[PDB]
Every structure is written in structure tokens, then in C-alpha cells.
Amino acid sequence: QGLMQFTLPVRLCKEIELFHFDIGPFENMWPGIFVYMVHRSCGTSCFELEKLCRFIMSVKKNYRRVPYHNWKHAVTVAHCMYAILQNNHTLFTDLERKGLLIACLCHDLDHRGFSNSYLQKFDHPLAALYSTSTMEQHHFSQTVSILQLEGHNIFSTLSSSEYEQVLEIIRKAIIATDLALYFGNRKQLEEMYQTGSLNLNNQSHRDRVIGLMMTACDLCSVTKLWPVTKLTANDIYAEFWAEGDEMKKLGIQPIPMMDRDKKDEVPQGQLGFYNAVAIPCYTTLTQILPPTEPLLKACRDNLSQWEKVIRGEE
Ligand SMILES: Cc1ncc(C)n2nc(CCc3nc(N4CC[C@H](C(F)F)C4)nn3C)nc12
Ligand SMILES: [Mg+2]
Ligand SMILES: [Zn+2]
């Protein structure tokens, strides 16, 4: 068992270390890619291989066949986390390394392709059970479910309190993927960085830094090669526009983001998004973790590609 290191073909073995890596269209290799990432950022010791394989496959089963919030997104977001963890070797604890790749794999579990807002206006049962971060509290809830299935406790070797710390890291990490919470979280971090109050030994500071990392991994489609960025945007809008249709079915005008009638304004919508969300996100993250700069650089390159689309040059 212990002498069994997962290895990847040469092009993957090299490119998986880069922020901009695309996990590819071969579904059946994504589990191997994830285990490869856990082994290298954590050790072959972190998890019993049989248990982790059974956990990876139960997680996969519990993502749905929606255009964007799907199993490929889960593995994409984990690979970004893996790049961050490997470019900041010594800044993170053994538990953080363990908890965060799992958090990323699990962070959109059982997503239905609809925003918290649509669940609230539809009056979905999840919206009574969880008034804020509706889907994100569901995602953590599903994570705990899969962990408690026979033969799925990958954290079995942890002490009662180490186990509690790691489930607490996953919960806070998954909650942070609620983009409503990101704005405030980044503002606080900007201020603490600049007044020089930012302290990585302050647990509530680390928490904030991990939440910014989670937003960064979650938005990582904007840090890819242009053709990956552009084709992921089509999946993103395919969800948003179905939500827009469902909003109209309830007798509600959707926000412009979700109206397929406003297809032509996508380039301008992306600009706003890169300016309002992505750039500030990767800027503040680069300030706090200097070696994540390639994400900011790749983000600025894609903003510049959407500007070209608007100018009729693409
Ligand atoms: C790439 C990416 N990654 C992650 C996330 C969550 N998002 N969210 C978006 C949507 C961005 C957006 N599009 C619009 N539209 C376009 C047409 C409308 C116009 F007519 F008004 C307004 N507004 N905004 C804000 N892109 C991404
Ligand atoms: Mg989500
Ligand atoms: Zn996500």
C-alpha cells in the first residue's frame, strides 16, 4: 500500500504545478489528478488510499449534471488551492493542507444551478433551514454526510480535537465561497494589510486569509488561458440564464446578469466583474501571499482579452 505513488503523464506532471493548468476533458482522470495533488501537498500518509478513493467517488456522485457548478468545477477549484499551497509551502499547518483541498472538492456539493437569491424567491425548503449562505451551508452539511458514510472517514486517524479543527476549517472555507461575504472579507483584509495589523498567528486573521484563498480558487476560471476562460464563461451564463428564465416563470424580472435577452452585453458584464470582483480579489491575495502573483497577472490578461472583444478585435 504505502510505496504506491500516483504519477501523471509528463505534460500533466509539469503543467499541474502551474496556476493556469486545465484538468482536461477526460472525467475519469480527475480523481487521479486530485489524489496526485493530495499526495504532493500533504504526503501519502495524510489519508488511507481506499478511504479517500471511496470519499472522492461519493463526492463526485453528489455533484449534479449542471453546466457550471459540477464535478469538473470542484476539481478545478481544488487544483487552484493546490497551486497556492505548493507556492506557499511553509505558511500553512498540516491540518490546513488536509482540510482545504477537501473543502475545495466539496465546496459546491449537490449544487442545483441556482443562486441563494432564487432559492429565497422560490421559497425552497433549504431557504427556511438556512437564511444566509443558503447553498453554502447545504454544501458543508452534504460534506459531513459523506464523511459519516461507512468507510468514508478520511480523518479517522485525527484526534477528537484535530478532527474538530479540520471540520471547522472546512466549514469556514466552504461558507467563504458565498460571494456576498467576499466584499467585506477583502475590505477588512485590505485595511489590516495596510495599517500593518495583519497577523497570521491571529486565528481570526488566518480565517480571513483562507476565505480570500477560497474566493480566489472559486473564481480561477478568469486566471486560465483565454480559450478556457472564454468557454467557461459560456457555462457560467448557461446557468445564470436558466435562473433568469425561472425568475420570469415566478413573474419577476431577473437582474441583467441572468437575462438571456442581454446576451450582447456579456463582454461589458465581464469587465464589471473583473473590475468589481476578480482584480481586487487577486490583488489583495498577491499583497498577502506574494507568490500567487501569476493569478493576478493571468486575471489582468483576461480582462484585457474582454476589452479586445468589446473593440471588435476578437
Ligand atoms: C467569469 C465569472 N466567474 C465567476 C462568477 C461568479 N462570474 N459571474 C459572472 C457574471 C458577470 C456579469 N455579467 C453581467 N451581465 C452580462 C450581461 C448583462 C448586461 F446587459 F447588463 C450583465 N453582469 N455581471 C456582473 N462572470 C463570472
Ligand atoms: Mg458555490
Ligand atoms: Zn464554486
mmCIF file of C-alpha atoms and ligand atoms in Angstrom:
data_model
loop_
_atom_site.group_PDB
_atom_site.id
_atom_site.type_symbol
_atom_site.label_atom_id
_atom_site.label_comp_id
_atom_site.label_asym_id
_atom_site.label_seq_id
_atom_site.Cartn_x
_atom_site.Cartn_y
_atom_site.Cartn_z
ATOM 1 C CA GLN A 1 0.000 0.000 0.000
ATOM 2 C CA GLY A 2 2.488 2.738 1.258
ATOM 3 C CA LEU A 3 5.011 2.500 -1.699
ATOM 4 C CA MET A 4 2.137 3.347 -4.267
ATOM 5 C CA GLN A 5 2.678 6.965 -5.513
ATOM 6 C CA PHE A 6 0.180 8.093 -8.228
ATOM 7 C CA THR A 7 2.125 9.609 -11.221
ATOM 8 C CA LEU A 8 0.880 11.545 -14.230
ATOM 9 C CA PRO A 9 1.991 11.706 -17.856
ATOM 10 C CA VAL A 10 4.927 14.103 -18.332
ATOM 11 C CA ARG A 11 2.911 17.079 -19.756
ATOM 12 C CA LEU A 12 0.468 16.825 -16.772
ATOM 13 C CA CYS A 13 3.288 16.181 -14.241
ATOM 14 C CA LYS A 14 4.803 19.573 -15.251
ATOM 15 C CA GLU A 15 1.743 21.717 -16.055
ATOM 16 C CA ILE A 16 -0.288 20.676 -12.882
ATOM 17 C CA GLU A 17 2.251 22.750 -10.808
ATOM 18 C CA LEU A 18 1.189 25.939 -12.726
ATOM 19 C CA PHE A 19 -1.734 28.188 -11.627
ATOM 20 C CA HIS A 20 -3.245 28.148 -15.188
ATOM 21 C CA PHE A 21 -3.437 24.287 -15.590
ATOM 22 C CA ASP A 22 -6.697 22.961 -17.152
ATOM 23 C CA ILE A 23 -7.588 19.468 -15.773
ATOM 24 C CA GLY A 24 -8.809 18.461 -19.236
ATOM 25 C CA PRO A 25 -11.904 16.817 -20.697
ATOM 26 C CA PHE A 26 -11.194 13.202 -19.510
ATOM 27 C CA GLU A 27 -13.565 12.887 -16.493
ATOM 28 C CA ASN A 28 -12.043 9.521 -15.416
ATOM 29 C CA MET A 29 -8.617 11.158 -14.797
ATOM 30 C CA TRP A 30 -9.908 13.856 -12.394
ATOM 31 C CA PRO A 31 -9.858 11.535 -9.313
ATOM 32 C CA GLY A 32 -6.268 10.502 -10.089
ATOM 33 C CA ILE A 33 -5.367 14.187 -10.528
ATOM 34 C CA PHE A 34 -6.897 15.025 -7.112
ATOM 35 C CA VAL A 35 -5.111 12.123 -5.293
ATOM 36 C CA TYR A 36 -1.845 13.204 -7.020
ATOM 37 C CA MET A 37 -2.429 16.691 -5.593
ATOM 38 C CA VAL A 38 -3.188 15.405 -2.049
ATOM 39 C CA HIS A 39 -0.073 13.149 -2.078
ATOM 40 C CA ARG A 40 2.277 16.025 -3.076
ATOM 41 C CA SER A 41 0.832 18.876 -0.898
ATOM 42 C CA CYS A 42 0.107 16.657 2.164
ATOM 43 C CA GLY A 43 2.052 13.305 1.905
ATOM 44 C CA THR A 44 0.955 9.680 1.001
ATOM 45 C CA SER A 45 0.439 9.455 4.853
ATOM 46 C CA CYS A 46 -2.410 12.108 5.115
ATOM 47 C CA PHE A 47 -5.221 9.646 4.112
ATOM 48 C CA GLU A 48 -5.800 5.884 3.785
ATOM 49 C CA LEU A 49 -5.941 5.481 -0.053
ATOM 50 C CA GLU A 50 -9.018 3.068 -0.013
ATOM 51 C CA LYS A 51 -10.974 5.543 2.214
ATOM 52 C CA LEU A 52 -10.004 8.639 0.139
ATOM 53 C CA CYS A 53 -10.903 6.892 -3.201
ATOM 54 C CA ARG A 54 -14.332 5.945 -1.734
ATOM 55 C CA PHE A 55 -14.800 9.558 -0.467
ATOM 56 C CA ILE A 56 -13.749 11.099 -3.882
ATOM 57 C CA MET A 57 -16.288 8.859 -5.711
ATOM 58 C CA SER A 58 -19.157 9.628 -3.219
ATOM 59 C CA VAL A 59 -18.385 13.361 -3.611
ATOM 60 C CA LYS A 60 -18.469 13.021 -7.455
ATOM 61 C CA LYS A 61 -21.837 11.149 -7.227
ATOM 62 C CA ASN A 62 -23.326 14.091 -5.248
ATOM 63 C CA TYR A 63 -22.450 16.807 -7.796
ATOM 64 C CA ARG A 64 -25.182 17.167 -10.464
ATOM 65 C CA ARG A 65 -25.046 17.439 -14.291
ATOM 66 C CA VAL A 66 -25.412 21.291 -14.388
ATOM 67 C CA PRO A 67 -23.448 23.425 -16.902
ATOM 68 C CA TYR A 68 -21.014 25.063 -14.362
ATOM 69 C CA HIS A 69 -21.412 24.041 -10.637
ATOM 70 C CA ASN A 70 -20.385 20.456 -11.490
ATOM 71 C CA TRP A 71 -17.699 17.885 -10.624
ATOM 72 C CA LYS A 72 -15.185 19.486 -13.097
ATOM 73 C CA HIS A 73 -15.604 22.838 -11.262
ATOM 74 C CA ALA A 74 -14.955 21.055 -7.906
ATOM 75 C CA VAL A 75 -11.637 19.621 -9.174
ATOM 76 C CA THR A 76 -10.660 22.895 -10.939
ATOM 77 C CA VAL A 77 -11.117 24.811 -7.624
ATOM 78 C CA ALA A 78 -9.034 22.176 -5.692
ATOM 79 C CA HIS A 79 -6.193 22.324 -8.270
ATOM 80 C CA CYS A 80 -6.012 26.187 -7.758
ATOM 81 C CA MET A 81 -5.889 25.633 -3.944
ATOM 82 C CA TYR A 82 -3.101 23.012 -4.582
ATOM 83 C CA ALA A 83 -1.050 25.558 -6.587
ATOM 84 C CA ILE A 84 -1.484 28.124 -3.775
ATOM 85 C CA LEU A 85 -0.465 25.613 -1.083
ATOM 86 C CA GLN A 86 2.620 24.468 -3.066
ATOM 87 C CA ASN A 87 3.799 28.082 -3.817
ATOM 88 C CA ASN A 88 3.469 28.913 -0.006
ATOM 89 C CA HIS A 89 4.974 25.682 1.413
ATOM 90 C CA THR A 90 5.804 26.886 4.961
ATOM 91 C CA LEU A 91 2.830 29.298 5.703
ATOM 92 C CA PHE A 92 0.230 26.518 6.337
ATOM 93 C CA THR A 93 -0.330 23.850 9.029
ATOM 94 C CA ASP A 94 -0.639 20.076 8.345
ATOM 95 C CA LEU A 95 -4.393 20.266 9.117
ATOM 96 C CA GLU A 96 -4.917 23.287 6.804
ATOM 97 C CA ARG A 97 -3.224 21.389 3.943
ATOM 98 C CA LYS A 98 -5.519 18.320 4.691
ATOM 99 C CA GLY A 99 -8.707 20.389 5.207
ATOM 100 C CA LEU A 100 -8.509 22.922 2.325
ATOM 101 C CA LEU A 101 -8.151 20.559 -0.682
ATOM 102 C CA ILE A 102 -11.130 18.548 0.726
ATOM 103 C CA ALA A 103 -13.037 21.797 1.329
ATOM 104 C CA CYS A 104 -12.474 22.801 -2.330
ATOM 105 C CA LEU A 105 -13.553 19.355 -3.667
ATOM 106 C CA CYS A 106 -16.714 19.615 -1.517
ATOM 107 C CA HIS A 107 -17.477 23.365 -1.716
ATOM 108 C CA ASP A 108 -20.394 23.187 -4.220
ATOM 109 C CA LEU A 109 -21.700 19.667 -3.307
ATOM 110 C CA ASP A 110 -25.283 18.997 -4.578
ATOM 111 C CA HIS A 111 -25.472 22.437 -6.283
ATOM 112 C CA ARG A 112 -28.671 22.740 -8.379
ATOM 113 C CA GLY A 113 -27.509 25.584 -10.727
ATOM 114 C CA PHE A 114 -29.478 28.308 -8.843
ATOM 115 C CA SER A 115 -28.336 31.226 -6.674
ATOM 116 C CA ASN A 116 -29.219 31.688 -2.952
ATOM 117 C CA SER A 117 -31.441 34.532 -4.207
ATOM 118 C CA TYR A 118 -33.510 32.192 -6.466
ATOM 119 C CA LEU A 119 -33.923 29.659 -3.643
ATOM 120 C CA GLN A 120 -35.251 32.540 -1.407
ATOM 121 C CA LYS A 121 -37.696 33.794 -4.014
ATOM 122 C CA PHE A 122 -38.832 30.267 -4.950
ATOM 123 C CA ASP A 123 -39.242 29.603 -1.179
ATOM 124 C CA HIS A 124 -37.203 26.371 -1.413
ATOM 125 C CA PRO A 125 -37.074 24.352 1.863
ATOM 126 C CA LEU A 126 -33.256 24.980 2.072
ATOM 127 C CA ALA A 127 -34.084 28.755 2.407
ATOM 128 C CA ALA A 128 -36.158 28.095 5.602
ATOM 129 C CA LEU A 129 -33.409 25.805 7.056
ATOM 130 C CA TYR A 130 -30.581 28.415 6.288
ATOM 131 C CA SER A 131 -31.476 32.187 5.989
ATOM 132 C CA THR A 132 -27.987 33.232 4.747
ATOM 133 C CA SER A 133 -25.318 31.486 2.698
ATOM 134 C CA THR A 134 -28.186 29.046 1.880
ATOM 135 C CA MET A 135 -26.392 26.793 -0.646
ATOM 136 C CA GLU A 136 -23.025 27.086 1.166
ATOM 137 C CA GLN A 137 -24.488 25.719 4.473
ATOM 138 C CA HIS A 138 -26.026 22.902 2.394
ATOM 139 C CA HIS A 139 -22.566 22.212 0.804
ATOM 140 C CA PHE A 140 -20.960 21.786 4.293
ATOM 141 C CA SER A 141 -23.951 19.707 5.505
ATOM 142 C CA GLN A 142 -23.529 17.334 2.498
ATOM 143 C CA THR A 143 -19.751 17.149 3.227
ATOM 144 C CA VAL A 144 -20.381 15.960 6.840
ATOM 145 C CA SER A 145 -22.974 13.434 5.448
ATOM 146 C CA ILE A 146 -20.469 11.826 3.061
ATOM 147 C CA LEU A 147 -17.770 11.819 5.820
ATOM 148 C CA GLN A 148 -20.148 9.784 8.086
ATOM 149 C CA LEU A 149 -20.904 7.070 5.461
ATOM 150 C CA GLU A 150 -19.376 3.637 6.313
ATOM 151 C CA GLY A 151 -15.742 3.585 5.096
ATOM 152 C CA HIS A 152 -15.600 7.339 4.156
ATOM 153 C CA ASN A 153 -13.993 8.839 7.322
ATOM 154 C CA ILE A 154 -10.727 10.050 5.760
ATOM 155 C CA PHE A 155 -9.961 11.989 9.015
ATOM 156 C CA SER A 156 -10.307 8.770 11.176
ATOM 157 C CA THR A 157 -6.561 8.933 12.210
ATOM 158 C CA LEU A 158 -7.011 12.510 13.643
ATOM 159 C CA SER A 159 -7.537 13.150 17.435
ATOM 160 C CA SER A 160 -11.049 14.231 18.560
ATOM 161 C CA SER A 161 -9.884 17.904 18.634
ATOM 162 C CA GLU A 162 -7.662 17.787 15.488
ATOM 163 C CA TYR A 163 -10.813 16.287 13.818
ATOM 164 C CA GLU A 164 -12.915 19.239 15.159
ATOM 165 C CA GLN A 165 -10.300 21.831 13.989
ATOM 166 C CA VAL A 166 -10.235 20.320 10.437
ATOM 167 C CA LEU A 167 -14.148 20.200 10.164
ATOM 168 C CA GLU A 168 -14.114 23.849 11.395
ATOM 169 C CA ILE A 169 -11.532 24.824 8.674
ATOM 170 C CA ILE A 170 -13.732 23.091 6.024
ATOM 171 C CA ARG A 171 -16.927 24.823 7.307
ATOM 172 C CA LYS A 172 -15.387 28.330 7.364
ATOM 173 C CA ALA A 173 -13.687 27.624 3.953
ATOM 174 C CA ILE A 174 -16.977 26.495 2.320
ATOM 175 C CA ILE A 175 -19.012 29.386 3.875
ATOM 176 C CA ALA A 176 -16.407 31.863 2.452
ATOM 177 C CA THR A 177 -17.328 30.714 -1.125
ATOM 178 C CA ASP A 178 -20.504 32.800 -0.626
ATOM 179 C CA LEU A 179 -19.560 35.730 -2.839
ATOM 180 C CA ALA A 180 -21.962 38.069 -0.812
ATOM 181 C CA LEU A 181 -19.451 37.589 2.062
ATOM 182 C CA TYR A 182 -16.304 38.187 -0.026
ATOM 183 C CA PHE A 183 -16.567 42.015 -0.399
ATOM 184 C CA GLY A 184 -16.494 42.688 3.352
ATOM 185 C CA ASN A 185 -13.853 39.969 3.845
ATOM 186 C CA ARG A 186 -11.492 41.508 1.259
ATOM 187 C CA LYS A 187 -12.104 45.136 2.595
ATOM 188 C CA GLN A 188 -11.149 44.028 6.137
ATOM 189 C CA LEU A 189 -8.006 42.275 4.753
ATOM 190 C CA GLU A 190 -7.023 45.324 2.589
ATOM 191 C CA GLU A 191 -7.229 47.540 5.750
ATOM 192 C CA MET A 192 -5.328 45.091 8.048
ATOM 193 C CA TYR A 193 -2.552 44.645 5.407
ATOM 194 C CA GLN A 194 -2.146 48.463 5.007
ATOM 195 C CA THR A 195 -2.315 49.504 8.699
ATOM 196 C CA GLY A 196 0.139 46.527 9.252
ATOM 197 C CA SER A 197 -2.270 44.929 11.828
ATOM 198 C CA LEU A 198 -2.413 41.702 9.680
ATOM 199 C CA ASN A 199 -1.085 38.913 11.997
ATOM 200 C CA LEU A 200 -1.013 35.256 10.679
ATOM 201 C CA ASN A 201 -0.803 33.955 14.329
ATOM 202 C CA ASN A 202 -4.243 35.586 14.955
ATOM 203 C CA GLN A 203 -6.663 32.685 14.203
ATOM 204 C CA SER A 204 -9.425 35.161 13.043
ATOM 205 C CA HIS A 205 -6.882 36.659 10.532
ATOM 206 C CA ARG A 206 -5.882 33.236 9.140
ATOM 207 C CA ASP A 207 -9.624 32.523 8.797
ATOM 208 C CA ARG A 208 -9.993 35.693 6.657
ATOM 209 C CA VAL A 209 -6.882 34.826 4.549
ATOM 210 C CA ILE A 210 -8.259 31.270 3.881
ATOM 211 C CA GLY A 211 -11.621 32.801 2.908
ATOM 212 C CA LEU A 212 -9.835 35.050 0.383
ATOM 213 C CA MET A 213 -7.889 31.990 -0.895
ATOM 214 C CA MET A 214 -11.324 30.205 -1.303
ATOM 215 C CA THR A 215 -12.765 33.122 -3.329
ATOM 216 C CA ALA A 216 -9.530 33.079 -5.447
ATOM 217 C CA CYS A 217 -9.743 29.294 -6.200
ATOM 218 C CA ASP A 218 -13.531 29.520 -6.766
ATOM 219 C CA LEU A 219 -13.093 32.368 -9.364
ATOM 220 C CA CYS A 220 -9.957 30.715 -11.007
ATOM 221 C CA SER A 221 -11.642 30.365 -14.484
ATOM 222 C CA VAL A 222 -10.554 34.061 -15.003
ATOM 223 C CA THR A 223 -6.842 33.052 -14.440
ATOM 224 C CA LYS A 224 -6.739 30.417 -17.226
ATOM 225 C CA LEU A 225 -5.582 30.568 -20.844
ATOM 226 C CA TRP A 226 -8.027 32.822 -22.767
ATOM 227 C CA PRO A 227 -9.811 29.941 -24.641
ATOM 228 C CA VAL A 228 -10.548 28.129 -21.296
ATOM 229 C CA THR A 229 -11.745 31.445 -19.724
ATOM 230 C CA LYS A 230 -13.999 32.208 -22.683
ATOM 231 C CA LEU A 231 -15.613 28.682 -22.850
ATOM 232 C CA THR A 232 -16.080 28.530 -19.028
ATOM 233 C CA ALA A 233 -17.934 31.921 -19.280
ATOM 234 C CA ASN A 234 -20.471 30.184 -21.676
ATOM 235 C CA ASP A 235 -21.141 27.507 -18.975
ATOM 236 C CA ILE A 236 -21.478 30.268 -16.324
ATOM 237 C CA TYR A 237 -24.093 32.167 -18.359
ATOM 238 C CA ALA A 238 -25.937 28.892 -19.292
ATOM 239 C CA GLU A 239 -26.714 28.514 -15.555
ATOM 240 C CA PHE A 240 -27.421 32.237 -14.961
ATOM 241 C CA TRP A 241 -29.796 32.418 -17.987
ATOM 242 C CA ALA A 242 -31.769 29.287 -16.892
ATOM 243 C CA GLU A 243 -32.108 31.009 -13.466
ATOM 244 C CA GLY A 244 -33.317 34.112 -15.370
ATOM 245 C CA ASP A 245 -35.960 32.034 -17.158
ATOM 246 C CA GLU A 246 -37.077 30.534 -13.774
ATOM 247 C CA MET A 247 -37.260 34.089 -12.317
ATOM 248 C CA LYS A 248 -39.549 35.121 -15.229
ATOM 249 C CA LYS A 249 -41.666 31.959 -14.543
ATOM 250 C CA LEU A 250 -42.234 33.277 -10.972
ATOM 251 C CA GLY A 251 -43.380 36.664 -12.564
ATOM 252 C CA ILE A 252 -40.096 38.502 -11.639
ATOM 253 C CA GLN A 253 -37.752 40.493 -13.958
ATOM 254 C CA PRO A 254 -34.304 38.898 -13.371
ATOM 255 C CA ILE A 255 -31.187 41.068 -12.812
ATOM 256 C CA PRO A 256 -29.365 41.809 -16.128
ATOM 257 C CA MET A 257 -26.657 39.094 -15.340
ATOM 258 C CA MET A 258 -29.382 36.390 -15.689
ATOM 259 C CA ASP A 259 -31.389 37.685 -18.702
ATOM 260 C CA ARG A 260 -30.569 35.784 -21.961
ATOM 261 C CA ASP A 261 -32.166 38.803 -23.772
ATOM 262 C CA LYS A 262 -28.947 40.722 -22.773
ATOM 263 C CA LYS A 263 -26.523 38.191 -24.433
ATOM 264 C CA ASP A 264 -24.814 41.038 -26.371
ATOM 265 C CA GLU A 265 -23.712 42.773 -23.085
ATOM 266 C CA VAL A 266 -21.613 39.773 -21.857
ATOM 267 C CA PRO A 267 -18.274 41.465 -22.650
ATOM 268 C CA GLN A 268 -19.333 44.577 -20.613
ATOM 269 C CA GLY A 269 -20.705 42.321 -17.751
ATOM 270 C CA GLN A 270 -17.303 40.513 -17.621
ATOM 271 C CA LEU A 271 -15.392 43.899 -17.452
ATOM 272 C CA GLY A 272 -17.557 44.966 -14.477
ATOM 273 C CA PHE A 273 -16.958 41.531 -12.886
ATOM 274 C CA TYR A 274 -13.138 41.650 -13.408
ATOM 275 C CA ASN A 275 -13.084 45.307 -12.097
ATOM 276 C CA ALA A 276 -15.607 44.848 -9.210
ATOM 277 C CA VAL A 277 -14.572 41.304 -8.087
ATOM 278 C CA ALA A 278 -11.738 39.339 -9.717
ATOM 279 C CA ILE A 279 -8.953 42.000 -9.864
ATOM 280 C CA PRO A 280 -9.459 43.282 -6.279
ATOM 281 C CA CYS A 281 -9.563 39.625 -5.198
ATOM 282 C CA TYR A 282 -6.234 38.595 -6.821
ATOM 283 C CA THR A 283 -4.601 41.999 -5.926
ATOM 284 C CA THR A 284 -5.256 41.682 -2.147
ATOM 285 C CA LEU A 285 -4.268 37.931 -2.327
ATOM 286 C CA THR A 286 -0.918 38.837 -4.015
ATOM 287 C CA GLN A 287 -0.233 41.531 -1.288
ATOM 288 C CA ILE A 288 -0.774 38.904 1.459
ATOM 289 C CA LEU A 289 0.801 35.890 -0.424
ATOM 290 C CA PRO A 290 3.371 37.284 -2.891
ATOM 291 C CA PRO A 291 3.950 34.001 -4.824
ATOM 292 C CA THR A 292 0.233 33.922 -6.019
ATOM 293 C CA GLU A 293 1.034 36.832 -8.369
ATOM 294 C CA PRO A 294 0.606 34.658 -11.523
ATOM 295 C CA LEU A 295 -3.185 34.573 -10.710
ATOM 296 C CA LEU A 296 -3.330 38.444 -10.758
ATOM 297 C CA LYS A 297 -1.245 38.576 -13.953
ATOM 298 C CA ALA A 298 -3.426 35.929 -15.720
ATOM 299 C CA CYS A 299 -6.586 37.789 -14.493
ATOM 300 C CA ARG A 300 -5.372 41.167 -15.886
ATOM 301 C CA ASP A 301 -4.525 39.354 -19.215
ATOM 302 C CA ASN A 302 -8.137 38.008 -19.473
ATOM 303 C CA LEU A 303 -9.614 41.490 -18.587
ATOM 304 C CA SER A 304 -7.511 42.799 -21.452
ATOM 305 C CA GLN A 305 -8.937 39.983 -23.707
ATOM 306 C CA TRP A 306 -12.585 41.019 -22.857
ATOM 307 C CA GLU A 307 -11.647 44.662 -23.665
ATOM 308 C CA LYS A 308 -10.459 43.379 -27.101
ATOM 309 C CA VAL A 309 -13.825 41.588 -27.577
ATOM 310 C CA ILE A 310 -15.700 44.884 -26.982
ATOM 311 C CA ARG A 311 -13.366 46.748 -29.531
ATOM 312 C CA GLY A 312 -14.382 44.143 -32.212
ATOM 313 C CA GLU A 313 -10.665 42.867 -32.258
ATOM 314 C CA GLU A 314 -11.900 39.295 -31.130
HETATM 315 C C1 LIG B 1 -16.166 34.649 -15.023
HETATM 316 C C2 LIG B 1 -17.025 34.538 -13.804
HETATM 317 N N1 LIG B 1 -16.616 33.769 -12.824
HETATM 318 C C3 LIG B 1 -17.388 33.644 -11.695
HETATM 319 C C4 LIG B 1 -18.560 34.274 -11.491
HETATM 320 C C5 LIG B 1 -19.410 34.140 -10.273
HETATM 321 N N2 LIG B 1 -18.984 35.119 -12.577
HETATM 322 N N3 LIG B 1 -20.095 35.860 -12.604
HETATM 323 C C6 LIG B 1 -20.068 36.386 -13.805
HETATM 324 C C7 LIG B 1 -21.121 37.293 -14.349
HETATM 325 C C8 LIG B 1 -20.663 38.725 -14.557
HETATM 326 C C9 LIG B 1 -21.742 39.623 -15.068
HETATM 327 N N4 LIG B 1 -22.353 39.512 -16.254
HETATM 328 C C10 LIG B 1 -23.246 40.533 -16.210
HETATM 329 N N5 LIG B 1 -24.095 40.762 -17.211
HETATM 330 C C11 LIG B 1 -23.756 40.404 -18.558
HETATM 331 C C12 LIG B 1 -24.937 40.896 -19.370
HETATM 332 C C13 LIG B 1 -25.614 41.974 -18.520
HETATM 333 C C14 LIG B 1 -25.714 43.455 -19.180
HETATM 334 F F1 LIG B 1 -26.684 43.619 -20.124
HETATM 335 F F2 LIG B 1 -26.216 44.335 -18.272
HETATM 336 C C15 LIG B 1 -24.873 41.975 -17.178
HETATM 337 N N6 LIG B 1 -23.246 41.277 -15.122
HETATM 338 N N7 LIG B 1 -22.222 40.665 -14.404
HETATM 339 C C16 LIG B 1 -21.854 41.162 -13.089
HETATM 340 N N8 LIG B 1 -18.973 36.073 -14.534
HETATM 341 C C17 LIG B 1 -18.289 35.267 -13.735
HETATM 342 MG MG MG B 2 -20.802 27.903 -4.548
HETATM 343 ZN ZN ZN B 3 -17.723 27.124 -6.696
#
